Design a protein around this nucleic acid. Structure first.
Lengths: 744, 600, 453
RNA sequence: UGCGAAAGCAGUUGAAGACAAGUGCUUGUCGUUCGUUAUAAAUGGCCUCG
């Protein structure tokens, strides 16, 4: 009956090698410069630049070869080396795949395999028919080999020949022409630049020579290099430092030239084709065009994310390609690729996947380097310790929630992600972003936070929901006071009501409630009211103190007003509360800690058995239908008939759910349809011979009363969230930022 | 929802046809036009007696009577008010039966007798509808003939349904148009259902179907809001118009026990998805949508009660939840007397609120999966524990902990399988009988910590554990759902300081401020007075509790001499607390000429 | 790139009435007795004062027509429904009819009685009939065509009749209220001269107004009571007024959030708005220098600026009419000029609320110690001076505490060599101690409140 | 760092290797490792299109 199928895409693919910089971007703009090719983690998309829409899509799932092979793409080359819309994909393992865009995928691409002996392919580049491949071989520093690659027609094989070798490569960069390589080694350090296809350029010099003396007296941040860039002619080499100073060196005489605007570690440096301009980007959220004849500077500030990478992409420098990070989400690394028209510095093409904010970090996500160790950044020393700590947390520790709140729009079926201080509106039908709206105050885009400002925490959207009608948006926010202050421990809780017309795309804020339920009391649960009561313009808000507030929208005030309140001043605090409302709207089920209460809406008080004691704290209380109520406690789940008041079925969740998740996440893991039945989702660690980072997920369809299992399906990765679309199908989000669907 | 006491409208005459109680309802007819929510009048045809119109409120009274010969049987009767050629008039149409030899259709017009007309009908007049707008009288006959006459009984139209022995016909109006559906038995439990629309022919056949498995002889039929309800062998079959397709079946257990032949069953619709079912002298108001018994009432003073008609509320459109129903009550005694009785019925709001816990329908942990991943017999044990000798603590504890593989003396999350209430309650019962006095097994300590400790044994539980301080202490801290009254009386009775503190925290934690105040008023003035003295001699919760006492005492009951002292005590505690605050916040926190001596 | 978010700095019925901000006070020569509004655009309103009647332009809010032919005190200026006529009463008892906006012509002059005629009202439904009430205690109903004899002469009043009302949808019904405390209803279709029935107010009736076709509101003595003729009894009664209520006016179907409004003079200087939909409950009011004798508002179809008019015994007339770049601190913060932005906060003649925002912004910005690093006693006092006053306010109380601590933790040694700053702390000690002291009762009082409940 | 409520309740912050400086010894460091649940500071601030 039911079946599972992936629907949306995932995060854009990046060259995630620590040593490689200036070349993290793998995407390529067509020779005709009419469309852009972007490889994703699970797909390859082709977007026509002129219309800024995805003209073509190529899924590895569709192609058997790509499905088996996909390992990540290390590079794309336009055309076919072996041989007008052909491309060659090089992956890290060494598979070379000749694929076609602008057409239909061929189920038998010219798959090949370059032979490497314990080498991880890092880069490939060409000038005119000649191809060299860079590979990684193994002090915590990886060494590199430069090989010559050619295709022999007789054997139809890619033969590899050795050119050069370098050891303990710290940092590396390739010229815009793709013909010069500059790198750093510890043989403290020395920088060497070499021509790739010729022997014309071969130079080396210690870092000490360019390195100044005052910085030598100063901390390591001043001596720490964060980025490097080499001019096409090789006459100029730019080195950026963690302190935020940029230094240009003339290779002919090693003369030094200081350009200092960035206050934090400069992350991306790139020379222009002629060499007269230098592009810089860093934590300031601002791209700087340094005019080198005069050291003037122009600014394109205000960008969404800090600049991981920056390049000039065009025969005449018509466009700039930039990589943005969105460090605010510490759980995941949120990459956004921007192509700007150099003429007017306007967004020619913005590309990103879904941007969920998980509760904790996942896999090997590490914060970018900064001048000091903060919540949103890692210091120079902090990187290794943080990586080890992350791995050992994923292995030894047992709390592995990695759960994200997601919301679905009844009127438009658009997917809402509560990003930190903002909401992403993402269309999974088209697999493209439709909007990004900032819904809170704070230093959110006013500037780029730098140094201690980076320790600031912007307001966090905790709970986001829609009314059943869908024209209203209820949002709950927590504002964190600044540290080192008397009022540094008094968190502020805010509630906001927003509206928009169907044609209009931006929500307009209609009312604001400051400190609902009192001061320092969080809004742990929110439930929109059913259609029967107040034709879907009411809502319920529930605390950890068991207090309930029913709000409705009054036409006379034109605003949202507190119709009913019940504030039993309980002294025990618990974040485990669940709320359900009957479809008729007569009654409300409120599970607080271990006890469930049936409260009559008219009196807004206990029914006149109203009290149901359970073994342990309730995580979720839900009614699949009016007759049956499904209640999940931390140890089990139980189906009760309200009609007879007895349990039908009981299922033990302890072996899987003991302390893996914080209370309240079962709400977003457990989903129900209003017609057919509900679903239970369980994620487990796969371990062979100590736990391993990779996970496995199981989704089970249950009928109303949980008598039978309609279906049982397995996914290969942590399904962060699952919810019921208003159609019979259910949508599920995976930590690969992948939205699949289970449905009839 | 509720059912009132019936009140008498009239006493039925002692006629032989009415002597058979089981068929008595058949011999009494209720006019549909005059009986509704808003009408205060009922027109009733009592076979062999008369057709009589009564007013109900303020007091039942007979307003009109038309006598009928004793040998005549009323098969169909209707009364409707209208305008006739214009004068405001009341039209009464009734069919009478003489020995099956001749069949009489009669129409009477009265001024609000203006006229009386009588004709011979071909077959049994079963349903009569009066159309005051068009001045028409429509009579359905058992031979399948639907005949439309004027008020003068001049035959205007005749339609044949092509089926004889018609057994059920009901009129209804939808969207302003008149409709009638007719049921005709066929052989082998088959039934012809025909739905007809009243508008060259004024009668248009909309639907004709054959239903199988539909018996009549033991089947009770009623209609409401497009739904046909059939009670048969304790099962209510709900069919939906216009195709009369079986939509649902409800099993009604309380009728399944009835022996076939002795129990007198009557049945009507009273609102949307709500019916009234009378079994002998018992009356039930039932919600069919939610399968709940909204109300029940037993008429001890009558042998039987049979429904005749009920004024049906369209609760979806009506704010009124109040209506009436009429029936025949037969008394107990050697000379039973039958009377007409009316019952006032509150149907309710038609919400799920009404139906909870009123169902008329009467565990083991199941694995999630049937079959390389990290992991984070009740009766037998009851018998083993019961077989043990009296006052053997060691054997009891050994058997319990070993058989249930329990590792800790207190409840842990690992012990979920044990949480079945039935097993626990028996173990509690055994411990009480097995052990008495000053020695109890450790099994109780485990049971006290159990979240599903039965509510039934909560009462007097603290009283039982008074002798052991530890068991008493364990109950307060963890044992669930302790009654508040026992906690309060025990709070003011204990002199031990530590238990007083724990009890107050447990009381304040598990009970709202409003709830605790009311009980605490019941407490004697002396005990509270004693309690206040102890405070004179975590503490914030106790002080908060003291503040709660003062209000329950009330400004009047408070006596000046004591209040001065307590005023002194709190004042000393004020400066102690204020002094503490300052300490806490505290812990958080070149000359022109200089003379100096150098050192050499 | 994105534009910069700009720094972000009662009942609906009350807010509507607050919009009558423009207040003009005019002086008349005697007590202003009666105020009328022309039913027709520009809806010019008439005032009866001394021996003259003055017509005021709605837009100009100034006299446009002055009617001085009246010899003795004038007692009315009511317009007909068309507004082309206006009728008036005089102490001599003669009732005069003039063409509105044409003072000169006396179109109809009738001598109702030798006694004063205080009330003269055109019948709303029927134009030709004009009703006159006099101190003779007979309310003659006159006709324009018949100037020599009344069409009907209503009697039965044993005291002065000073109130005459015509019930909408019931042209035949005529309501009269005398100083007997009795409100008498008459039918003109019948022979008349005898009330259909009498309603007892128990106090002298100063004005009777028909709010709606079935509801009539009578304001007499210290209270006004609404009566329904179908029930023949008072539905509702409000006595919030302290002086005797004198005049009462009603408007409906006007653009306010409230559908209908009822304005009642008190004679204690108060005119208050009552809403019929909520049982005639008090929603708004205004105060004046002296007793209010007359009150009026622009009719529903004003088609222009709405007007509220109040009449005082002193002769005073009050008219209340409802007419139908980025700052320096914002630049400093956008330019990251932390210290200067704080300086802008403490400048003379700066709104307190705005001063809070910039302080809030800097705190939210994580720029607090930075804004205070480069400061001395000379430039620190302005912050302290604000802190000394801000501490009193609840909203600023948390903020001042935050700022004061940082400067305190940041300028300890400086405070030692600066005597002036020390005294600022000393008075700061006293005020916070008072603020403590004020708060201390608040916890006492709130607990006290808890006892009763 | 664990748990919990937000308040808080408990528990941590070790060892080896290499380099630099000062005088084999002392101190400080680590784009080194093993193990435990485990101040900053290179004068350096955000474009233009009315």
């Amino acid at each position: 009956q039911y079946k599972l199928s992936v629907v949306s895409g995932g995060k854009p693919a990046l060259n995630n090698l620590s040593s490689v910089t200036g070349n993290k971007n793998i995407a390529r703009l067509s020779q005709d410069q009419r469309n852009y090719i972007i490889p994703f983690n699970n797909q390859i998309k082709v977007y026509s630049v002129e219309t800024r829409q995805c003209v073509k899509t190529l899924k590895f799932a569709n192609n058997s070869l790509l499905s088996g092979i996909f390992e990540s793409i290390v590079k794309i080359l336009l055309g076919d080396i072996t041989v007008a819309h052909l491309i060659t994909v090089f992956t890290n393992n060494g598979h070379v795949i000749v694929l076609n865009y602008k057409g239909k995928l061929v189920e038998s691409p010219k798959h090949f395999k370059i032979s490497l002996a314990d080498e991880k392919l890092a880069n490939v580049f060409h000038s005119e028919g000649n191809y060299r491949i860079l590979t990684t071989f193994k002090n915590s520093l990886q060494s590199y080999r430069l090989y010559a690659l050619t295709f022999d027609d007789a054997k139809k094989q890619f033969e590899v020949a050795h050119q050069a070798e370098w050891h303990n490569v710290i940092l590396s960069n390739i010229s815009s022409n793709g013909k010069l390589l500059a790198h750093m080694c510890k043989d403290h350090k020395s920088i060497s630049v070499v021509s790739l296809f010729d022997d014309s350029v071969n130079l080396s010099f210690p870092l000490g020579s360019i390195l100044s003396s005052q910085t030598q007296s100063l901390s390591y941040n001043t001596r720490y290099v964060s980025s490097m860039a080499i001019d096409n002619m090789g006459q100029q080499l730019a080195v950026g430092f963690a302190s935020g100073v940029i230094s240009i060196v003339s290779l002919a005489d090693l003369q030094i030239r200081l350009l200092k605007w960035h206050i934090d570690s400069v992350l991306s440096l790139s020379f222009s084709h002629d060499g007269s301009y230098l592009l810089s980007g860093g934590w300031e959220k601002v791209m700087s065009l340094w005019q080198l004849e005069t050291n003037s500077q122009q600014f394109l500030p205000r960008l969404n994310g800090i600049i991981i990478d920056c390049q000039v992409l065009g025969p005449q420098g018509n466009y700039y390609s930039l990589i943005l990070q969105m460090t605010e989400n510490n759980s995941n690394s949120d990459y956004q690729f921007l192509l700007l028209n150099a003429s007017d510095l306007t967004s020619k093409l913005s590309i990103n996947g879904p941007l969920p904010v998980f509760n904790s970090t996942i896999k090997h996500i590490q914060q970018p380097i900064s001048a000091m160790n903060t919540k949103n950044s890692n210091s120079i020393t902090s990187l290794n310790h943080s990586k080890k700590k992350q791995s050992r947390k994923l292995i030894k520790s047992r709390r592995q929630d990695f759960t994200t709140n997601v919301e679905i729009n009844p009127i438009n079926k658009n997917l809402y992600f509560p990003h930190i201080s903002a909401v992403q509106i993402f269309d999974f039908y088209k697999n493209e972003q439709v909007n990004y709206q900032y819904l809170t105050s704070g230093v959110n885009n006013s500037m780029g936070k730098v140094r201690f400002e980076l320790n600031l925490q912007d307001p966090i959207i905790t709970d986001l929901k829609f009314t059943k009608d869908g024209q209203w948006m209820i949002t709950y926010e927590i504002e964190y006071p600044p540290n080192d202050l008397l009022s540094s421990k008094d968190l502020t809780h805010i509630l906001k009501f927003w509206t928009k017309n169907d044609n209009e795309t931006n929500w307009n804020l209609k009312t604001k409630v400051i400190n609902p339920h009192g001061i320092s009391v969080p809004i742990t649960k929110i439930l929109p009211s059913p259609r029967s009561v107040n034709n879907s313009q009411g809502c319920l808000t529930a605390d950890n103190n068991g207090g309930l507030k029913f709000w409705s929208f009054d036409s006379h005030e034109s605003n949202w007003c507190l119709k009913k309140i019940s504030l039993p001043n309980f002294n025990h605090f618990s974040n485990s509360v669940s709320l359900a409302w009957s479809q008729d709207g007569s009654l409300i089920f409120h599970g607080f800690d271990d006890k469930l209460q049936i409260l009559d809406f008219d009196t807004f008080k206990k029914f006149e058995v109203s009290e149901f004691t359970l073994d342990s704290e309730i995580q979720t209380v839900k009614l699949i239908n009016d007759t049956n109520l499904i209640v999940a406690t931390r140890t089990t789940l139980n189906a009760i008939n309200l009609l007879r008041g007895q349990v039908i079925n009981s299922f033990d969740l302890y072996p899987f759910v003991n302390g893996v998740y914080k209370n309240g996440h079962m709400d977003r893991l457990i989903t129900c349809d209003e017609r057919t039945g509900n679903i239970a989702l369980v994620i487990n660690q796969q371990l062979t011979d100590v736990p391993t980072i990779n996970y496995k997920s199981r989704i089970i369809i249950f009928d109303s009363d949980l008598s039978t299992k309609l279906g049982n399906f397995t996914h290969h990765e942590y399904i962060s969230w699952i919810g019921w679309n208003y159609d019979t199908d259910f949508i599920f989000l995976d930590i690969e930022s992948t939205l699949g669907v289970v449905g009839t | 929802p509720s059912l009132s006491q019936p009140f008498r409208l009239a006493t039925l005459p002692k006629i032989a046809s009415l002597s058979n109680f089981s068929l008595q309802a058949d011999y009494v007819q209720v006019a549909d036009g005059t009986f509704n929510e808003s009408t205060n009048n009922i027109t009733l045809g009592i076979s062999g007696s008369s057709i009589s119109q009564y007013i109900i409120n303020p007091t039942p009274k007979l307003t009109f009577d038309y006598p009928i010969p004793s040998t005549n049987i009323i098969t169909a009767c209707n009364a409707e008010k209208g305008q006739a050629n214009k004068r405001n008039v009341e039209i009464w149409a009734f069919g009478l039966m003489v020995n099956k030899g001749n069949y009489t259709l009669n129409v009477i017009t009265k001024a609000l007798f203006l006229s009386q007309y009588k004709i011979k009908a071909k077959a049994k007049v079963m349903s009569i509808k009066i159309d005051t707008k068009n001045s028409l009288v429509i009579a359905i006959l058992q031979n399948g003939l639907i005949e439309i006459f004027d008020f003068k009984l001049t035959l205007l139209h005749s339609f044949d349904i092509s089926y004889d022995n018609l057994k059920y016909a009901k009129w209804f109006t939808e969207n302003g148009t008149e409709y009638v559906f007719v049921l005709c038995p066929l052989q082998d439990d088959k039934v012809c259902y025909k739905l007809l629309e009243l508008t060259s022919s004024p009668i248009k056949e909309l639907s004709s179907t054959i239903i199988e498995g539909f018996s009549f002889e033991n089947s009770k039929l009623c209609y409401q809001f497009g739904k046909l309800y059939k009670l048969n062998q304790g099962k209510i079959y709900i069919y939906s118009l216009p195709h009369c397709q079986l939509q649902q079946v409800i099993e009604f257990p309380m009728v399944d026990k009835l022996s076939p032949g002795d129990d007198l069953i009557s049945f009507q619709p009273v609102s949307v998805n709500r019916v009234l079912l009378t079994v002998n002298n018992v009356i039930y108001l039932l919600d069919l949508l939610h399968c709940s018994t909204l109300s029940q009432r037993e008429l001890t003073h009558v042998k039987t009660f049979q429904l005749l008609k009920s004024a049906v509320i369209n609760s979806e459109k009506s704010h009124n939840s109040k209506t009436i129903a009429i029936g025949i009550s037969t008394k107990n005694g050697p000379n039973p007397t039958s009377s007409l009785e009316i019952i006032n019925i509150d149907v309710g709001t038609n919400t799920l609120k009404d139906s909870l816990g009123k169902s008329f329908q009467v565990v083991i942990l199941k694995p999630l999966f049937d079959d390389r991943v990290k992991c984070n017999h009740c009766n037998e044990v009851i018998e083993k524990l019961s077989a043990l000798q009296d006052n053997d603590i060691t054997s009891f504890d050994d058997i319990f902990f070993k058989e249930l593989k329990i590792k800790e003396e207190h409840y842990t999350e690992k012990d979920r399988y044990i949480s079945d209430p039935g097993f626990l309650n028996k173990v509690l019962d055994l411990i009480f009988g097995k052990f008495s006095g000053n020695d109890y097994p450790k099994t109780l300590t485990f049971l006290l910590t159990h979240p599903l400790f039965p509510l039934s044994r909560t009462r007097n539980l603290l009283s039982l554990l008074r002798d052991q301080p530890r068991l008493f202490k364990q109950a307060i801290v963890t044992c669930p759902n302790l009654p508040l009254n026992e906690l309060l009386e025990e709070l003011f009775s204990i002199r031990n300081r530590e238990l007083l503190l724990d009890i107050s925290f447990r009381i304040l934690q598990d009970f709202t401020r409003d709830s605790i105040k009311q009980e605490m008023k019941k407490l004697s003035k002396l005990d509270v007075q004693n309690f206040i003295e102890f405070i004179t001699s975590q503490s914030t919760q106790l002080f908060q509790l003291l503040s709660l006492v003062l209000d329950s005492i009330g400004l009047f009951s408070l006596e000046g001499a004591l209040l001065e002292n307590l005023t002194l005590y709190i004042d000393k505690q004020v400066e102690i607390a204020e002094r503490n605050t300052e300490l806490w916040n505290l812990i958080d926190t070149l000359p022109t000429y200089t003379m100096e001596y150098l050192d050499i | 790139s994105t534009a910069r978010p700009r720094i972000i700095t009662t009942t609906p019925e009350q807010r509507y009435w607050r919009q009558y901000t423009s207040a003009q006070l005019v002086k008349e020569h005697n007590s202003v007795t009666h105020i009328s509004f022309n039913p027709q655009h520009p809806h010019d309103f008439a005032v009866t004062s001394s021996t003259r009647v003055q017509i005021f332009s709605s837009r100009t809010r100034q006299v446009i027509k002055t009617f001085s032919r009246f010899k003795d005190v004038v007692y009315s200026a009511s317009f007909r429904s068309d507004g082309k006529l206006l009728c008036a009463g005089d102490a001599t008892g003669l009732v005069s009819v003039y063409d509105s906006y044409n003072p000169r012509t006396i179109l109809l002059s009738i001598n109702a009685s030798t006694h004063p005629t205080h009330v003269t009202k055109f019948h709303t439904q029927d134009n030709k009939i004009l009703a006159t009430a006099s101190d003779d205690r007979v309310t003659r109903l006159w006709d324009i065509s018949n100037a020599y004899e009344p069409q009907l002469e209503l009697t039965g009043a044993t005291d002065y009749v000073r109130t005459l009302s015509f019930i909408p949808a019931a042209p035949h019904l005529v309501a009269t209220g005398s100083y007997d405390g009795l409100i008498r209803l008459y039918d003109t279709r019948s022979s008349g001269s005898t009330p259909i029935y009498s309603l007892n107010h128990d106090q002298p009736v100063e004005n009777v107004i028909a709010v709606s076709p079935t509801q009539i509101v009578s304001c007499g003595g210290n209270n006004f009571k609404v009566w329904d003729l179908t029930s023949n009894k008072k539905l509702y009664e409000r006595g919030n007024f302290n002086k005797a209520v004198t005049c009462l006016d009603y408007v409906e179907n006007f653009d306010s959030p409230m559908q209908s409004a009822l304005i009642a003079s008190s004679l204690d200087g108060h005119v208050k708005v009552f809403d019929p939909l909520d049982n005639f409950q008090v929603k708004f009011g205004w105060k004046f220098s002296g007793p209010v004798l007359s009150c009026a508002v622009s009719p529903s179809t004003a088609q222009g600026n709405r007007h509220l008019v109040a009449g005082l015994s002193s002769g005073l007339l009050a008219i209340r009419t409802k007419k139908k770049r980025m700052r320096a601190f914002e630049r400093n913060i956008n330019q990251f000029k932390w210290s200067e932005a704080l300086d802008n906060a403490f400048v003379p003649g700066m709104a307190k609320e705005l001063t809070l925002t910039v302080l809030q912004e800097l705190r939210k910005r994580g720029k607090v110690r930075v804004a205070l690093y480069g400061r001395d006693e000379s430039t620190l006092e302005p912050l302290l001076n604000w802190c000394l006053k801000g501490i009193e306010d609840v909203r600023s109380a948390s903020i001042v505490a935050d700022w004061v601590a940082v400067v305190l933790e940041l300028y300890g040694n400086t405070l030692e060599s600066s005597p002036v700053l020390q005294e600022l702390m000393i008075d700061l000690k006293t005020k916070v101690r008072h603020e403590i002291h004020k708060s201390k009762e608040a916890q006492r009082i709130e607990g006290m409140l808890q006892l009763l409940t």
